[PDB]
Design a binder for this molecule. Structure first.
Ligand SMILES: [Mg+2]
Ligand SMILES: [Mg+2]
Ligand SMILES: [Mg+2]
Ligand SMILES: [Mg+2]
Ligand SMILES: [Mg+2]
Ligand SMILES: [Mg+2]
Ligand SMILES: [Mg+2]
Ligand SMILES: [Mg+2]
Ligand SMILES: [Mg+2]
Ligand SMILES: [Mg+2]
Ligand SMILES: [Mg+2]
Ligand SMILES: [Mg+2]
Ligand SMILES: [Mg+2]
Ligand SMILES: [Mg+2]
Ligand SMILES: [Mg+2]
Ligand SMILES: [Mg+2]
Ligand SMILES: [Mg+2]
Ligand SMILES: [Mg+2]
Ligand SMILES: [Mg+2]
Ligand SMILES: [Mg+2]
Ligand SMILES: [Mg+2]
Ligand SMILES: [Mg+2]
Ligand SMILES: [Mg+2]
Ligand SMILES: [Mg+2]
Ligand SMILES: [Mg+2]
Ligand SMILES: [Mg+2]
Ligand SMILES: [Mg+2]
Ligand SMILES: [Mg+2]
Ligand SMILES: [Zn+2]
Lengths: 38, 76, 136, 96, 94
RNA sequence: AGCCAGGAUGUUGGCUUAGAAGCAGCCAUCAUUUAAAGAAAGCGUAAUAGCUCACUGGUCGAGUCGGCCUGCGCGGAAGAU
RNA sequence: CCUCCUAAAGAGUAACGGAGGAGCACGAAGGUUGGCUAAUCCUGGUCGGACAUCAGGAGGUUAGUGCAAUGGCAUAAGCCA
RNA sequence: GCUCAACGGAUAAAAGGUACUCCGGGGAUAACAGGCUGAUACCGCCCAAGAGUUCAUAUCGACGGCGGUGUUUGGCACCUCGAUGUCGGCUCAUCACAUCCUGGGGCUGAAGUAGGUCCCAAGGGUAUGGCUGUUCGCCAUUUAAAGUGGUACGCGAGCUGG
């Protein structure tokens, strides 16, 4: 979990989703890629 | 610092403006160069101070090939 | 790091930075990075931006730096009281008004140029925008 | 016969490799001195060298001086290491 | 080729111009030949799209104002400093 | 947008490298069988192999894509009785 | 004490604000009459060369002002008699 | 006839020390603490050149950019000069969380053990000595850990006075 101010799609498999009013990158392929805005 | 100095202000500039009726001898312009040139009935001082040589109204004008400001006095 | 070779005067008044810019259009290049924001780019900042963009463009196509840091900014040394003359010149700025084309670029594809400009932009303090060559 | 080696530039140490401590002075002497933390201890994290400075009233000035001292020490260390290696080499040469 | 619709400007000046700009219109002028200058307003959005094309500046345009087809060429365009916008256009009767 | 299929040939392009076979780079970036297939976008390998992708064929049967302009919001946002 | 800027287009206007000068000189460097027009560059020319002195052109005051800076100055306030 | 140049020129004619001091005043004006501020400091974040065999973003992150805190060095001189006692130690603490331990979790360049890093978490806990007036620090030996800060750099009408 990379908590950042800027969250970005790092690959094709990265998807940006909003969960309970928090922007999140979740990725099916790469576990490293998953992010959270904080 | 090497900077704190400046000279006393010399209170120059146009003293009597266009249309202003003056007595003879009245200073019209205090100036450094001949920023204004002495026209009709205006004398130029030693420090280029323009003064009326006759009673009447100040008349600024642009005259001549060099397009210079001439101050004349027109009699009333 | 850009700086005037010679100067008429070693220090300078603060001044104000109000108004719109004059170098508004893409003149030389094909694409430009136009400043949207008001502020002041230091020499350092400008250089950084240039470095960012050149690398991005991989030494292919020309870059112009339309801005120049011609204004010296003084800083008083630390732990020094408020009197005793003006501080020493530390760095040089270009004062930036909205509308300022900061950088210009040609000999590049458009997308790549855009990318380069974006890269540059993060180095600069002001909010900026990509612009293009306009006929008239 | 020895080759003309390129004289490498003495590299600037990073603030990441450095610990900067600030603290009160010894003996001091006054009210403002008891409060103020002017003294500077710079420490190199990879090597373990320390430089102290408390000559100046200004903390910044002290730090600058301390920084310089640290740099000098680093240079000296580099020189020493160079010398040691050199010494090994000749010792080996002497062996012949 | 390009047919633009215009209205004759009632009020001229700075404030008026600003108001026009606010209301998604923009001031323009037709001038040239023996005929007097004609100040017009133009709907901004429509004109911006037209001006995106390079053919806009090259070709003869037709400005229709008060049911009168005036054949013109774009002479100079003022743009907003930092926005994709038009402050003003000068037109020359061709 | 899913889904099913192909996703080749000269060829592993040479070089320089310990090896380099789309993927260490350096460089050229062609043509072929053509429905389409980059001297290759990512994963992968000692390197090959292998796994994806681009583009394309089939199914399916109505809107869809991503820029611009602006209005209002979200995160960015930690302190001591 | 003088000049400029700060100084907000009359005057004036502060700071341990930013820049520079003066504590004189000259019996001509003053008065007047008469006359004259600069810097720099190119080309040619004994010694003579980037640079003396002589021509001619371009040039147009970029020069000059007994000295700081500013304002002036061909009607020259500049240069000769 | 005056570098009366401290140039409206106090005399013709004049350096200093005072911690042995004294009086009159001033928070008009300094040292402490408070306040405003935040350059500096500390703590974040944005961009990503690169390092990381390969691979920017496991972990680092250059050139630059944007913040927060009030937290160091400062700036200011608003509070106090008809007194607001100063570092440290002791005795008592109390709050913050930017968490040192213990608890929960993500990613890992996470096999395991042990780590690294980030998120959540302030319930409780969080060393004895040697040296130095010390804070700090270095060292010795522990410890699950020996947190970082605020509190007039907490606390002298509670002690000490190095
Ligand atoms: Mg301007
Ligand atoms: Mg108005
Ligand atoms: Mg917000
Ligand atoms: Mg004035
Ligand atoms: Mg005024
Ligand atoms: Mg004469
Ligand atoms: Mg004369
Ligand atoms: Mg006096
Ligand atoms: Mg006096
Ligand atoms: Mg004493
Ligand atoms: Mg007393
Ligand atoms: Mg204080
Ligand atoms: Mg108080
Ligand atoms: Mg604040
Ligand atoms: Mg950095
Ligand atoms: Mg006060
Ligand atoms: Mg005051
Ligand atoms: Mg007091
Ligand atoms: Mg009292
Ligand atoms: Mg927390
Ligand atoms: Mg963990
Ligand atoms: Mg409970
Ligand atoms: Mg003992
Ligand atoms: Mg205390
Ligand atoms: Mg005490
Ligand atoms: Mg007592
Ligand atoms: Mg009390
Ligand atoms: Mg004692
Ligand atoms: Zn991903």
């Amino acid at each position: 979990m990379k908590v950042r101010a800027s969250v970005k799609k790092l690959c094709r498999n990265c998807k940006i989703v909003k969960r309970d009013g928090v922007i999140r990158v979740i990725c099916s392929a790469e576990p490293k890629h998953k992010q959270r805005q904080g | 610092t090497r900077n704190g100095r400046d000279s006393e202000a010399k209170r120059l500039g146009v003293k009597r403006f266009g249309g202003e009726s003056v007595l003879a001898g009245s200073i019209i312009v205090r100036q450094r160069g001949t920023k204004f040139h002495a026209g009709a009935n205006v004398g130029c001082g030693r420090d280029h101070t323009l003064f009326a040589k006759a009673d009447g109204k100040v008349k600024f004008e642009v005259k001549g090939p060099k397009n210079r400001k001439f101050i004349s006095i027109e009699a009333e | 790091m850009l700086q005037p070779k010679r100067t008429k005067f070693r220090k300078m008044h603060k001044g104000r930075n109000r108004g719109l810019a004059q170098g508004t259009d893409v003149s030389f290049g094909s694409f430009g990075l136009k400043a949207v924001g008001r502020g002041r780019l230091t020499a350092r900042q400008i250089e950084a931006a240039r470095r960012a963009m050149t690398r991005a463009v991989k030494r292919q196509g020309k870059i112009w730096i339309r801005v120049f840091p011609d204004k010296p900014i003084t800083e008083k040394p630390l732990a020094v009281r408020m009197g005793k003359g003006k501080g020493n010149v530390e760095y040089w700025v270009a004062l930036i008004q909205p509308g300022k084309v900061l950088y210009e670029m040609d000999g590049v594809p458009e997308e790549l140029a855009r990318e380069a400009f974006k890269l540059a932009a993060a180095k600069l303090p002001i909010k900026t925008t990509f612009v293009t060559k306009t006929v008239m | 016969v020895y080759p003309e080696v390129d004289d490498d530039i003495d590299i600037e140490i990073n603030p990441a490799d450095l610990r900067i401590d600030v603290y009160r002075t010894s003996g001091a002497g006054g009210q403002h001195v008891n409060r103020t933390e002017s003294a500077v201890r710079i420490t190199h994290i990879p090597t373990g060298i320390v430089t102290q400075c408390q000559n100046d009233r200004s903390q910044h000035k002290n730090k600058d001086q301390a920084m310089k001292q640290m740099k000098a020490k680093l240079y000296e260390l580099e020189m020493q290491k160079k010398n040691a290696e050199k010494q090994a080499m000749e010792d080996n040469k002497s062996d012949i | 080729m390009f047919t633009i619709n215009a209205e004759v400007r009632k009020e001229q000046g700075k404030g008026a111009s600003r108001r026009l700009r606010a209301a998604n219109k923009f001031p323009a002028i037709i001038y040239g030949g023996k005929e007097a200058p004609l100040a017009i307003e133009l709907d901004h959005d429509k004109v911006m799209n037209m001006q995106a094309k390079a053919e806009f500046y090259s070709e003869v345009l037709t400005i229709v104002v008060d049911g009168k087809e005036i054949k013109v060429k774009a002479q100079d365009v003022q743009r907003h400093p930092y926005k994709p916008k038009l402050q003003h256009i000068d037109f020359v009767r061709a």
